Design a protein around this motif. Structure first.
Motif, PDB file in Angstrom:
ATOM      1  N   UNK A  66       0.824  -1.198   0.000  1.00 27.13           N
ATOM      2  CA  UNK A  66       0.000   0.000   0.000  1.00 27.13           C
ATOM      3  C   UNK A  66       0.853   1.241   0.000  1.00 27.13           C
ATOM      4  N   UNK A  67       0.755   2.003  -1.083  1.00 32.76           N
ATOM      5  CA  UNK A  67       1.455   3.268  -1.264  1.00 32.76           C
ATOM      6  C   UNK A  67       1.289   4.167  -0.026  1.00 32.76           C
ATOM      7  N   UNK A  68       2.359   4.874   0.327  1.00 31.32           N
ATOM      8  CA  UNK A  68       2.327   5.800   1.454  1.00 31.32           C
ATOM      9  C   UNK A  68       1.363   6.935   1.109  1.00 31.32           C
ATOM     10  N   UNK A  69       0.295   7.085   1.904  1.00 30.16           N
ATOM     11  CA  UNK A  69      -0.760   8.091   1.760  1.00 30.16           C
ATOM     12  C   UNK A  69      -0.274   9.502   2.041  1.00 30.16           C
ATOM     13  N   UNK A  70      -0.760  10.503   1.283  1.00 27.59           N
ATOM     14  CA  UNK A  70      -0.306  11.868   1.566  1.00 27.59           C
ATOM     15  C   UNK A  70      -0.733  12.247   2.993  1.00 27.59           C
ATOM     16  N   UNK A  71       0.002  13.162   3.624  1.00 33.98           N
ATOM     17  CA  UNK A  71      -0.307  13.593   4.986  1.00 33.98           C
ATOM     18  C   UNK A  71       0.774  14.526   5.500  1.00 33.98           C
ATOM     19  N   UNK A  72       0.955  14.573   6.817  1.00 37.52           N
ATOM     20  CA  UNK A  72       1.979  15.450   7.402  1.00 37.52           C
ATOM     21  C   UNK A  72       3.146  14.673   7.986  1.00 37.52           C
ATOM     22  N   UNK A  73       4.358  15.029   7.579  1.00 44.14           N
ATOM     23  CA  UNK A  73       5.533  14.339   8.054  1.00 44.14           C
ATOM     24  C   UNK A  73       5.624  14.279   9.570  1.00 44.14           C
ATOM     25  N   UNK A  74       6.010  13.114  10.075  1.00 44.06           N
ATOM     26  CA  UNK A  74       6.156  12.860  11.505  1.00 44.06           C
ATOM     27  C   UNK A  74       7.529  12.225  11.824  1.00 44.06           C
ATOM     28  N   UNK A  75       8.574  13.043  11.971  1.00 45.25           N
ATOM     29  CA  UNK A  75       9.879  12.475  12.286  1.00 45.25           C
ATOM     30  C   UNK A  75       9.949  12.086  13.750  1.00 45.25           C
TER      31      UNK A  75
END
Length: 483
Positions: A152-161
DNA sequence: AAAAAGACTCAGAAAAATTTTT
DNA sequence: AAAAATTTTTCTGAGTCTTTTT
């Protein structure tokens, strides 16, 4: 299929044939119901589709304290504007005047709503899920059906390092088929991109293991989709991983004698190297590669320790020549430890620590490359990381040895097993969590021998998933295996 | 010689399934 | 059963080590 009972391929060649259906892209974005509102400066404002979605990400995380921090907001808001139409860019000058509440409330609703769903509904989505797996969760490598780990392709969203990450809050874009690279055998059927699209590239490279990749926008890192741990291609590399660590077992005391000698060296480089290895060997310290500034959070490893990470104590709490370590490692996991070292080491450290500023590199004149270069010389294919495996696994071996109770019940033996594990987890500094080491550091054959020795059913130690992962170890191991 | 690109292992969070109590 | 506790699974971020390129 006992692949372990086969002939390993030459080096470089990973497979001869390979066929997959490509990635499952993230489903489309459905806009908010007209009743669900956004406000800017206390004024209802319907957003551009792209803008709305992004706002939804934020809106969806509103409760985390994540969203309160400066980097996050700055990073977040900047990226959002990019997704705004010109006119929107003109009005929303700041994030602080935006109202994501109705947005926040909405989703929370959706949340509980799901959390309460009918059982039939619960099953429908499983069958749905399962159907997905059957269709995109497997590939054909060479002569068998193999499961794909992450399809499953990584869904767009907000980066969480992790930790104090400088790119926290940045938007992950939607990956289009035009971003994906396909890896498969020439003679294989090429998956068809979604209607109206094209793959970025289609390659037939059998020197690599992935089936799909693309570059993640925020760190410019290449993402891949590879197979399940149960793979031959995976399980073979791991079997080899442990194999190597046993080779170290066989020449560790030699290497040790050498470095102890090097501590004495003329060329300081040789000294830094040696001390560094002392640590790796003794404490299980990671390579500590040089990280690119401003890209990640400030975490260090053995070769990258800044003088401010250790504090030297000629004596402390009874012991003499104590080194106090205190830094953040991979995933920003904190490393703190007061360690009595060899007087020689200690002496070298004072020297490495003089005339410098807190930020300076303890082992300047040294790097992972330099280090590993020397290691391979000592042993073909020897790297800093081998040390960690060797230690974990070897630690597990004796621990269980001295801890295993003959006049003990299965329930009892399991604990012995788990304590032996803690000792490992402890040295690896997994945070306490026995998962990582159980899953990635411990030669499973050791556990298989033990279970056999103590007439303890593997099932009692390894779960379904793990068993599938260690099946080689499971199928080919004597009660008498000895790491 | 060195730095950037490439690829594969390992890491805890978040989430979802399971189990265990109340 | 509810709801709380624990374990398992999914996600993708974070390193190590390698190979390409300059």
């Amino acid at each position: 299929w006992k692949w372990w009972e086969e002939e390993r391929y030459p080096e470089g060649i990973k497979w001869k044939f390979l066929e997959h259906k490509g990635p499952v892209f993230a489903p489309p974005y459905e806009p908010l119901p007209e009743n669900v509102k956004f406000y800017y400066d206390g004024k209802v404002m319907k957003l551009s589709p792209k803008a709305e979605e992004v706002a939804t990400f934020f809106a969806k995380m509103l409760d985390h304290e994540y969203t309160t921090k400066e980097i996050f907001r700055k990073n977040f808001f900047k990226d959002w504007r990019k997704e705004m139409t010109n006119e929107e860019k003109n009005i929303i000058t700041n994030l602080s005047k935006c109202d994501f509440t109705q947005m926040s409330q909405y989703f929370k609703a959706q949340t509980e709503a799901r959390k309460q769903m009918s059982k039939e509904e619960k099953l429908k989505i499983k069958e749905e899920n399962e159907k997905l797996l059957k269709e995109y969760g497997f590939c054909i490598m060479d002569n068998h059906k193999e499961r794909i780990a992450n399809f499953k392709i990584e869904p767009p969203g907000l980066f969480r390092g992790r930790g104090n990450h400088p790119k926290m809050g940045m938007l992950k874009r939607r990956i289009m088929p035009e971003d994906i690279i396909i890896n498969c055998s020439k003679d294989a059927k090429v998956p068809s991109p979604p209607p109206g699209h094209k793959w970025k590239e289609v390659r037939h490279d059998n020197k690599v293991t992935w089936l799909v990749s693309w570059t993640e926008n925020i760190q410019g890192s290449i993402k891949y989709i590879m197979l399940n741990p149960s793979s031959r291609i995976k399980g073979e590399k791991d079997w080899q991983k442990y194999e190597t660590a046993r080779r170290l077992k066989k020449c560790v005391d030699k290497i040790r004698n050498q470095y102890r000698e090097d501590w004495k060296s003329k060329e300081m480089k040789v000294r830094q190297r040696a001390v560094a290895l002392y640590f790796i060997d003794k404490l299980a310290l990671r390579a500590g590669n040089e990280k690119e500034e401003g890209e990640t959070a400030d975490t260090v490893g053995c070769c990258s320790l800044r003088v401010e990470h250790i504090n030297l104590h000629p004596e402390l709490d009874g012991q003499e020549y104590v080194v106090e370590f205190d830094f953040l490692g991979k995933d920003s996991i904190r490393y703190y430890n007061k360690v009595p070292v060899e007087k020689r080491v200690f002496k070298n450290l004072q020297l490495f620590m003089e005339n410098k500023q807190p930020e300076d590199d303890l082992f300047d004149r040294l790097n992972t490359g330099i280090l590993n270069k020397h290691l391979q010389d000592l042993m073909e294919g020897l790297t800093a990381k081998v040390f960690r495996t060797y230690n974990a696994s070897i630690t597990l071996q004796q621990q269980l040895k001295e801890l295993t109770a003959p006049d003990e019940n299965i329930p009892a033996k399991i604990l012995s097993y788990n304590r032996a594990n803690r000792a490992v987890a402890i040295l690896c500094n997994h945070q306490i969590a026995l998962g990582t080491s159980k899953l990635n550091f411990l030669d499973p054959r050791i556990t298989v021998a033990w279970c056999k020795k103590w007439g303890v059913p593997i099932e009692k130690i390894y779960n379904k998933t793990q068993r599938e992962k260690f099946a080689w170890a499971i199928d080919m191991a004597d009660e008498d295996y000895e790491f």
